[model samples]
Target: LFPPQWICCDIRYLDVSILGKFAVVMADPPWDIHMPYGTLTDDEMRRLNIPVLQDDGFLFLWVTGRAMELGRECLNLWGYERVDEIIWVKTNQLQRIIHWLNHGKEHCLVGVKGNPQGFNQGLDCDVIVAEVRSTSHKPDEIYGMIERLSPGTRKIELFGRPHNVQPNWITLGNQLDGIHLLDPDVVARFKQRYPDGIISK
Candidate 1:
């Protein structure tokens, strides 16, 4: 089994080629929600270097609010075909308490690239009625679903937080503690590119 790894660096600058191809690529982008936290512009998010990461794989994009359309555009830009959508029904607060009621579940856009093979489908339902956690914390069952679909393969999570780190998966984001690459080739390439171990903004 591959060891769990994580890199604490900016996604825009950190070269993805060094990490090699992955069977599954997941991302929870900071969309333009105009929230208190920093958010990426539509153009900026569109130009993300995602295509080079895989020739044939799955892209699970978490989208909500106004970013649903933007997420679909990113999938197209990354050369993936929108195949399915997963719904996360938040059970903690499942209803909108207002005159005009609506707003609870979130959508996860599933895109496929180049007709990837060997996926164990129909094991999990598209609708996930799960409990919510802290801010931006998704239910852990999503990972299990992905793992079951494409078992024992290289998977990477973009814009992942420290808590998102898991076994046999490579997590990358500025929110992580530090770099933790166990793969020899990845370690060598990473150091060769950034000798000082610090990615410039």
Candidate 2:
């Protein structure tokens, strides 16, 4: 509840003041890289206050088959330990596994900062079997799993869904063009402070 500027966006263009500190970061990087990372490289990520995520933070990065090696490299760049991965068994009765080389399973790397904090180590299973409706839409099950297993209360979705905001979930990304944060009071205060959604120290 003591979240300062809890949710934000246009990070690649915003001032440092717009970034807030959080405990868990869920990223679904689009480019699919070790190769070049993205529009913002590792160095650029540092500027976005990524290093201040938390002392005992947690990171979950999505990685497909071909990018496993690159995903490992990116984990180090983002200052996270390659702790574990959540296996998303992609499928549906209607959709057949399209193509020969596709495992149809997805990888979500679990990264951590300091101590385990409050992650329930007892239920650390790596597999999450669920149905897949589209390439962009991931199973809703992952949200519950991550939220429950998260080490802290505050969390941020790096490339969160464009659809809309969810309760207790702050988001960032192009998909959130005119979207508002879940908390009404926070949004009012934030807008009063930065009408343009840009803040700097």
Candidate 3:
């Protein structure tokens, strides 16, 4: 594993002439209205000459419900064709409103370089809404999607926190141990706290 600084440095300042050609690109930008709002700007994202998937390239973009529109705009700016979206359903979290409407789920948009194969064509669901326990984490169900869609796809998980793991999973945040990924007992406690409605499951 390379140092986090090395990866960030490549993304931040490395010339686009490098990176050669790649198949898949996944990015989870920190577009929160909070601090450390990630590095790329609107224009920068538009101009960044990173490798796009060759006909087979798939782009997985992680976006909050609050920044949904901007995320779409970014995809379009990056010249990727929108294909499908996978919704990450957090099972044991309090729902809150962002702007106005209740924002509970995060959307992971699956865009493609060309007219790619449709999702779950021979499988079951084309667009899956997988349930996961929340802990500043992306759902494993999403990674399952990546595995199914593009088994050998090169991945880059941008603005990722520690605990995210998979082959080709490139990260931008502190690569902490997988133990922080989840606490089974804590999730059980959360369920106990709710003990009734949706979260009780």
Q: What lDDT does the true structure give each of the candidates?
A: 0.87, 0.64, 0.54
Q: Looking at model 3, report the run of 10 residues with the lowest lDDT sum.
A: 1-10
Off by over 4 Å in 2: 1-8, 16-19, 32-48, 94-100, 182-195, 198-201
lDDT per residue (tens digit) for residues 22-51 in model 2: 667777765433342245554454445556
Model 1 per-residue lDDT tens digits across residues 55-143: 88999999987778889888998899999999988875664321166877789999999978888978988988777888788788899
Report the C-alpha lDDT of model 3 over 1-201, residue by residue, as the tens digit: 222211333344433232223456777765643443345565665555544424457788877754577778778777787777767655543442226866666778877776555434344344545455545567667667666766654455655665565655544343433222122443354345435412111
True lDDT of residue 68, candidate 1: 89
Which residue pairs in candidate 2 have backbone atoms (N, alpha carbon, C) closer than 3 angstroms, thus clashing?
none
From the highest lDDT down, the ranking of the candidates is 1, 2, 3
RMSD of each: 2.5, 4.6, 14.2
Which residue pairs clash in candidate 3? Answer: 53-57
**The candidate that achieves the highest TM-score relative to the unseen native structure:** 1
Model 2 CA lDDT for position 139: 77
Q: Candidate 1's error at 136, in angstroms? A: 0.9
The model with the greater TM-score, 2 or 3, is 2
